[PDB]
Design a protein around this ligand. Structure first.
Ligand SMILES: Nc1nc2c(ncn2[C@H]2C[C@H](O)[C@@H](COP(=O)(O)OP(=O)(O)OP(=O)(O)O)O2)c(=O)[nH]1
Lengths: 341, 118, 368
């Protein structure tokens, strides 16, 4: 719900379409829901006001459409040669279905479209692609059970997902790379278990949701803008920016709670090597986040002169920094969460 | 009230007296700025004042129409507005002055090309 | 656009005006209340231009008076220095001399050699630009016409003017010149533009009649500076407006007779311009549907903060535009510790606010 009333409509149709997928009984039904998602999302992404939006639209459509094409196609084969939706075993019939889904959600080797997207997308449009356009393909990846492909995805889901993030100066591309890394954790987590995967995505949704929702608020689009963005005290400049470290999930930031949950269950599966690699790369993720937080940790920097006052929406700001406060002191709610047992 | 003006574009206008009065006032001032020895001035006052004096006695628009003649009120206001533009342009034109140019000899003579006795 | 005199009375608003001053506008609210319903004939923007000291404030006041629009007074640089309880932050002496001490039009006129002048040179454009959005807010809410004495669109005239004099930096000229694009794209051009044209000498005659101890005795008033207005207005500023807005040029205000100006404007109608939409003139006002009206309306009644935040442009490559950190830190200390600035307006209970401990309200685009 950004400018027009039609935003509500397409969001609604999108929700129904994706909800069909997660509740879909057979591959065909899931494919049906996916395409409905494809419809509902293109108009929001393809704003008619500017240019960059429109180019992102062809790339999104021209990619997702092929993804759906291959997905249904590989479905027929699996559900021919096995004559049954739940094949007895994972063969060449099934890896193609993942390769479809991995591209649709933008996983490791199939990601290049995803950074190019961010240039076009505005903030909440990006946000909405970040969070919700990754549920359905992932929940389907749950049904597919090929260990090694997910493992190669998890291996490569952080390497590029962090090395690129080091390089980007446009906040749009950084969020892309930040999520591809985080997407590495979901994929591993879903290889292990689903209840923990459900939790981890939710906290990721929450965290990414608050993050970009302030970037929308202040319209900070470039590292220079972050250094230049006026704040009266240059203290809330720093209090608000703890969340950039909640990205890395360092204990006193509530991003630790999901990463701890995934780590605990994953090592219980004994894939210790995989943990080491993802967790090695996590530092590189947190590395450029400090590169972001040079703007706020120290105080009283050199600033532009013309600005005298800084202003923002009531609704967005009122919602935003409630979510932030939780990102600050979230852990002590250790009791409040009972879904881990 | 008359339903139509009988003409396309020319719409029925209410408060015609107010509009006509206001137009007459402005044109009178517009000619006021003119020099006092301009024939254009000399006549516009008497004509306009005759009109602007007829404007009052006939509250009925149709009665006023007959009294003023010269057409219906809807066009009549346009006539007034035209003249407003005329005065503003007239002041800018200074046509009360004397001859700008004397025609060359044999300019306005018809038939042409005939020899003459000096 | 039509004068009350030809109305034989006052104009009426076609529908109940929306309290945009004191109420927030929502997309829910757009669904619940239509926009162009209120719109009428006069829903348009008549911008004014002229060489400085043209006294057009009284002109625009009367013009809006007898055509029933809003006057919207001119630039008020002091408002940076004004607060909920009035007093001037210019009161605060040069405690922080280098780039925290004030600079008004007085200071500019006394001396444009100070690099700190560039501050208002851009902040002055923002003030115009913020005013412009206020005008659009009033239009789209009430449907009533507006008249701004001067526009951000025209501000660059003075900009290039001061730079040609040499007063601004080559750096600052680039900063402002590129930075206009960033925001200036996001405004609707006025329907009609009226420009007033005296010569440089003639305006010097009148500015000497203004008798202003911070201008008339000042030194900026060279023919070159006060003429650069003329060239820039004549070609650079006018032409693009001449493309979009309808342009009228009388000689000037003094001989500018209001009533003939009233009549000339009224004669210039725009139903004539309701032809092919693709026409580039009036282009920024062709709103197809009531929904698109509301998009424009919500975009100004609910995104003024967004409009302001476009100004957030990082440029630490210009020294005069950079501020010293520790000094700037103190400049922050002064402003927010000074009387009537500790909290949001209405919550400076140190300076008098009562009704607190229960009050939780905040105004639409209420400053902060
Ligand atoms: N540096 C700079 N100064 C400007 C600009 N625009 C106006 N000013 C300055 C020049 C003038 O000395 C002063 C305003 O004086 P005015 O000539 O506008 O008085 P005026 O008789 O036109 O009536 P009014 O100003 O509307 O009350 O502000 C600008 O764009 N940049």
């Amino acid at each position: 719900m950004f400018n027009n009333s039609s935003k509500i409509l397409f969001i609604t149709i999108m929700i129904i379409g994706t909800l069909i997928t997660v509740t879909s009984n057979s591959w065909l039904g899931a494919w049906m829901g996916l395409e409905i998602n494809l419809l509902s999302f293109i108009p929001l992404l393809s704003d008619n006001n500017n240019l960059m939006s429109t180019e992102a639209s062809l790339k999104y459509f021209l990619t997702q459409v092929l993804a759906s094409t291959v997905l249904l196609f590989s479905s027929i084969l699996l559900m021919l040669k096995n004559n049954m939706n739940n094949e007895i075993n994972e063969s060449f019939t099934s890896m193609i279905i993942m390769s479809a889904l991995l591209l649709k959600s933008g996983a490791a080797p199939f990601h290049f479209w995803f950074p190019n997207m961010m240039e076009g997308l505005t903030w909440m449009n990006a946000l909405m692609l970040m969070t919700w356009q990754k549920i359905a393909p992932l929940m389907l990846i749950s049904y597919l059970n090929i260990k090694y492909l997910l493992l190669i995805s998890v291996i490569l889901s952080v390497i590029i997902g962090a090395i690129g993030g080091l390089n980007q100066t446009s906040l749009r591309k950084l969020m892309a790379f930040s999520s591809i890394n985080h997407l590495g954790w979901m994929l591993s987590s879903l290889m292990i278990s689903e209840s923990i995967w459900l939790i981890y995505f939710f906290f990721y949704s929450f965290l990414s949701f608050v993050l970009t929702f302030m970037f929308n608020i202040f319209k900070l689009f470039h590292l220079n803008q972050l250094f230049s963005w006026f704040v009266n005290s240059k203290i809330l400049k720093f209090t608000l920016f703890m969340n950039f470290l909640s990205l890395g999930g360092l204990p006193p930031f509530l991003g630790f709670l999901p990463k701890w949950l995934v780590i605990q269950q994953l090592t219980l599966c004994n894939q210790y090597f995989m943990l080491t690699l993802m967790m090695m790369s996590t530092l590189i993720t947190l590395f450029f986040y400090l590169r972001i937080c040079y703007s706020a940790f120290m105080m009283n920097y050199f600033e532009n002169n013309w600005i005298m006052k800084m202003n923002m929406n009531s609704i967005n700001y009122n919602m935003y920094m409630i979510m932030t406060f939780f990102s600050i002191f979230g852990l002590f709610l250790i009791s409040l969460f009972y879904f881990m047992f | 009230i008359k339903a139509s003006t009988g003409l396309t574009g020319l719409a029925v206008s209410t408060n015609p007296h107010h509009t006509l009065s206001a137009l007459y006032g402005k044109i009178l001032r517009a000619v006021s700025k003119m020099p006092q020895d301009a024939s254009y001035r000399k006549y516009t006052e008497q004509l306009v004042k005759q009109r602007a004096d007829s404007v009052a006695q006939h509250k009925d628009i149709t009665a006023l129409e007959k009294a003023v003649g010269c057409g219906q009120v809807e066009e009549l206001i346009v006539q007034a507005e035209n003249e407003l533009i005329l005065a503003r342009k007239m002041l800018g034109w200074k046509p009360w002055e004397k001859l700008v140019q004397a025609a060359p000899a044999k300019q306005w003579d018809w038939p042409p090309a005939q020899i003459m006795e000096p | 656009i039509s004068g009350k005199t030809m109305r034989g009375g006052p104009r009426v608003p076609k529908a109940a005006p929306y309290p945009y001053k004191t109420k927030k506008y929502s997309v829910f609210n757009a669904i619940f209340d239509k926009t162009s319903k209120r719109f009428d004939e006069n829903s348009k923007v008549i911008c004014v231009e002229g060489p400085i000291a043209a006294g057009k404030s009284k002109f625009a006041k009367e013009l809006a008076e007898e055509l029933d629009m809003e006057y919207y007074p001119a630039v008020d640089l002091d408002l940076i220095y004004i607060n909920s309880y009035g007093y001037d932050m210019r009161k605060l002496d040069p405690q922080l001399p280098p780039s925290c001490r004030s600079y008004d039009v007085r200071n500019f006129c006394l001396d444009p050699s100070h690099d700190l002048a560039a501050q208002f040179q851009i902040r002055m454009y923002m003030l115009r630009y913020s005013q412009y959005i206020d005008a659009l807010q009033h239009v789209l809410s009430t449907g009533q016409g507006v008249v701004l004495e001067r526009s951000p669109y025209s501000d660059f005239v003075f900009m290039e003017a001061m730079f040609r004099q040499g007063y601004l930096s080559r750096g600052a000229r680039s900063v402002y010149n590129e930075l206009r694009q960033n925001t200036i794209g996001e405004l609707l051009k006025p329907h009609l533009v009226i420009y007033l044209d005296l010569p440089v000498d003639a305006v010097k005659k009148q500015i000497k009649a203004r008798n202003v101890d911070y201008e008339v005795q000042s030194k900026v008033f060279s023919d070159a500076y006060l003429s650069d207005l003329e060239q820039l207005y004549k070609q650079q500023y006018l032409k693009d407006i001449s493309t979009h807005a309808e342009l009228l040029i009388y000689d000037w205000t003094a001989g500018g007779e209001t009533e003939v100006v009233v009549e000339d404007i009224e004669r210039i109608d725009f139903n004539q311009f309701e032809a092919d939409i693709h026409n580039k003139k009036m282009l920024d006002w062709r709103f197809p549907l009531e929904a698109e009206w509301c998009e424009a309306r919500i975009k100004y009644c609910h995104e003024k903060p967004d409009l302001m935040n476009y100004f957030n442009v990082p440029r630490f490559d210009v020294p005069e535009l950079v501020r010293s950190a520790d000094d700037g830190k103190v400049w922050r200390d002064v402003w927010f510790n000074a009387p009537g600035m500790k909290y949001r307006p209405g919550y400076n209970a140190d300076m008098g606010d009562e009704g607190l401990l229960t009050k939780t309200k905040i105004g639409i685009n209420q400053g902060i």
